[PDB]
């Protein structure tokens, strides 16, 4: 079960391969590669991105509220007189 000699029992399968020296290292990396990457990105965009956008909104508001708190209070001095 841990040696290539005996791992599983398969039947009726064929495989075809070519030598590394008989083929290009970057085949269709301009017409077929980029579109596949775009498919990958698009297929998982809405599953991740939006949550991290919420994080950014929480981060900005926080900082804004923190600084907003340190501003002096005109309502604590109107009557101080």
In the shown chain, the binding pattern of residues 8 to 47 toward other proteins, with x for contact by CB under 8 A and - for none, equals -xxxxxxxxxxx-xx-------------------------
Contact, 7 vs 1, CB < 8 A?
A: yes
Residue with tokens 């075809």: 16
Query: What are the angstrom distances between the C-alpha of 42 and each of 17, 31, 51, 61, 78?
Result: 31, 18, 16, 29, 57
**Residues binding ligand CDL: number (CB under 6 A):** 5
Position of minimal CB gap to ligand CDL: 33
* 21 within 8 A of 15, measured Cβ to Cβ: no
Binding to ligand CDL, residues 23-52 (CB under 6 A): 29, 33-34, 36-37
In the complex, the smallest distance separating the C-beta of residue 4 from other proteins, rounded to whole angstroms, is: 12
**Interface residues toward ligand CDL, by CB under 6 A:** 29, 33-34, 36-37
């Amino acid at each position: 079960g841990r040696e290539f000699g005996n791992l599983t029992r398969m039947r009726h399968v064929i495989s075809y391969s070519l030598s590394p020296f008989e083929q290009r290292a970057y085949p269709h990396v301009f017409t077929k590669g980029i579109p596949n990457v775009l498919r990958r990105i698009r297929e998982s965009f809405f599953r991740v991105v939006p949550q991290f956008v919420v994080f950014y909104l929480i981060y900005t508001w926080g900082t804004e509220e923190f600084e907003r708190s340190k501003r002096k209070n005109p309502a604590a001095y109107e009557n101080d007189k």
